[PDB]
Amino acid sequence: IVEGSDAEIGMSPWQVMLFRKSPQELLCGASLISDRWVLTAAHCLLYPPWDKNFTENDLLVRIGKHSRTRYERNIEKISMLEKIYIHPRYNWRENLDRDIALMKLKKPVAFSDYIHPVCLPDRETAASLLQAGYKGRVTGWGNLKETWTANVGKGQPSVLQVVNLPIVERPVCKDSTRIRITDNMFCAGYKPDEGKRGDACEGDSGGPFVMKSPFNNRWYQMGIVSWGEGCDRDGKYGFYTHVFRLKKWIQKVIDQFGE
């Protein structure tokens, strides 16, 4: 998260951590949506051009975290996976279209002041909240800067970083990129007129992008952290997998399957 701010304890009890067993390392973000179902970008688990094709017995989900490196005992909770469901039409060759994946915990997770599920929107929440100009929030432990040869400081978060970013209008997203945009992917970030800055970044993929509904005081996941060109660069924005669009699939996989 570029130019973000440190979170607070229990500020996003749904942010999960994709942890690789060996080497031991931070894979990406995720989201507890049910006591036994987590959510993630498809590319954290699948990426032929880089040899990623993880199996469940190759990963760990750490919930309750806040510290990137420590091992917050009796606070966090580590869970093992039972199956990995990726979107059949996941398109890795050109633009990570349909960049979404569902993980099923070998066993259920209990809730505490730090482990709470996030809500998945409906057409009406999507309609009211998903609008150009409104602000959603992104949190994650990935890079603080875009890998630059000349940047001093070998930096990556001490603790869970958080940033609020506005939704931009689809035409603006499209004219900024030469990558083929798609209905299943939106963009956020300040525009060159605002002057400001902030962004998600390497390591942040798979992370939630939530919004709070003022009609019910409830947190809703509107997007998943996905891709971009560079991190925090001029006249550029970041892209999130439209969660509501692919929402039929999610539930298709969830309802009578892993219950």
Partner: peptide, 11 residues
């Protein structure tokens, strides 16, 4: 790196 974790979380 990361603080080692309970070995059990590798079964």
């Amino acid at each position: 790196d990361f603080e080692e974790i309970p070995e059990e979380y590798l079964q």
